[PDB]
Ligand SMILES: C[As](C)(=O)[O-]
Ligand SMILES: C[As](C)(=O)[O-]
Ligand SMILES: [Ca+2]
């Protein structure tokens with residue numbers, strides 16, 4: 519209803535090649551924005567979540583068909599994993615998982631009501647299990663926006679068996695002096711290397727910035743330029 | 751079915767008591783944090799009122815017993831959606847000048863009457879309550895940074911109102927210390943740049959301190975590992 523898909527090509531900072539396309543939810547707005555309140559309303563009702571899920575999986579499959587040679591990243595909030603429908607549509611798209619990355623978002627949404635009786639430890643176990651399942655289906659799993667939301671180092675550590683990628687988004691950290699932010703970037707870069715994970719830095723304004731990040735010992739990673747998403 | 755423990759916080763280098771932390775425990779043969787019980791209380795306003803009345807009175811008894819010392823209490827951000835929480839912080843406010851509110855990294859379910867708020871409006875509502883607590887003169891610490899929801903983004907959002915950030919080695923057993931040390935150094939610098947106090951908890955012994963120093967963790971309060979006990 520109030521929903522549509524956008525794509526953001528993810529462009530390598532140094533040579534500008536398209537590494538993958540990320541899929542983004544947007545509203546039907548004058549100027550489309552992420553539909554935060556609408557997705558939360560859907561997440562709070564199993565029947566609406568089922569309709570949303572049917573829409574999303576079909577629309578996304580249409581995109582996969584239209585670009586059959588490329589990798590697609592989709593965003594899934596951990597709280598989505600409390601609905602079996604989420605895993606059911608990942609299962610139905612599983613012939614394409616070799617070219618799909620599931621970016622687990624940093625979002626803290628209200629847990630669907632039929633799983634609210636679980637304590638905090640049992641909730642984390644349930645989610646980790648579902649991440650196991652997604653990994654088992656052969657999706658690449660990435661942690662999105664690390665050091666944001668609930669994507670703290672502890673969480674990244676719990677997900678670690680099942681992930682291939684850590685993403686750090688400069689955009690989420692505007693007001694931190696870069697020389698201060700650089701120490702967190704260096705920490706995550708080293709973590710990624712030690713654990714044979716790909717490290718991605720998103721929201722890099724120019725190649726100038728790359729070199730900037732380059733002096734202060736961030737050696738191995740993929741950088742993505744800032745660019746506007748657009749309708750699919 | 752709840753009781754309070756205290757954990758004296760002991761300086762790693764000279765062993766003095768910096769402050770005492772108040773910890774919730776159940777009535778078990780071996781007491782543990784009563785996670786399920788506290789979540790059930792958080793899910794029901796009437797039980798939360800009754801728990802709040804118990805807690806605040808019990809904690810006030812403690813304060814009277816040790817009138818010269820600083821006490822740290824843990825508050826989960828979701829407790830801020832209940833007006834009762836600010837009501838008892840308001841009632842204890844004559845002592846706020848020796849109380850630290852440690853905002854925990856917990857992700858509990860938000861009380862039902864505030865679930866209608868979108869994620870942005872929920873964050874603003876918590877931030878407003880933290881402003882209030884800071885306004886009452888409490889010291890506010892962020893507990894267990896880089897755990898739970900206490901990510902760098904959150905710490906940034908809390909920043910005007912905090913004086914302390916705490917990093918707990920205990921939460922990160924399986925990270926090789928030379929890798930963990932880069933995160934510790936990042937937070938140590940963040941604290942200095944922002945004139946926050948940096949605390950590293952869960953230091954087993956004095957050698958660790960040298961390590962921390964050799965890797966740019968210059969100014970911090972180290973705390974030893976020790977057992978809490980009934981108040
Ligand atoms: C070329 As590929 C590893 O993104 O499927
Ligand atoms: C010396 As003090 C501010 O920790 O009571
Ligand atoms: Ca993403």
Ligand SMILES: [Ca+2]
Nearest residue numbers: 771824852893
């Ligand atoms: Ca604490």
Ligand SMILES: [Cl-]
Nearest residue numbers: 541542543593
């Ligand atoms: Cl999205």
Ligand SMILES: [Cl-]
Nearest residue numbers: 600601602603
């Ligand atoms: Cl379900």
Ligand SMILES: [Cl-]
Nearest residue numbers: 665670896901
């Ligand atoms: Cl973090």
Ligand SMILES: [Cl-]
Nearest residue numbers: 772773774824
């Ligand atoms: Cl506690």
Ligand SMILES: [Cl-]
Nearest residue numbers: 922923924925
């Ligand atoms: Cl660990």
Ligand SMILES: [Cl-]
Nearest residue numbers: 938967968969
């Ligand atoms: Cl320091």
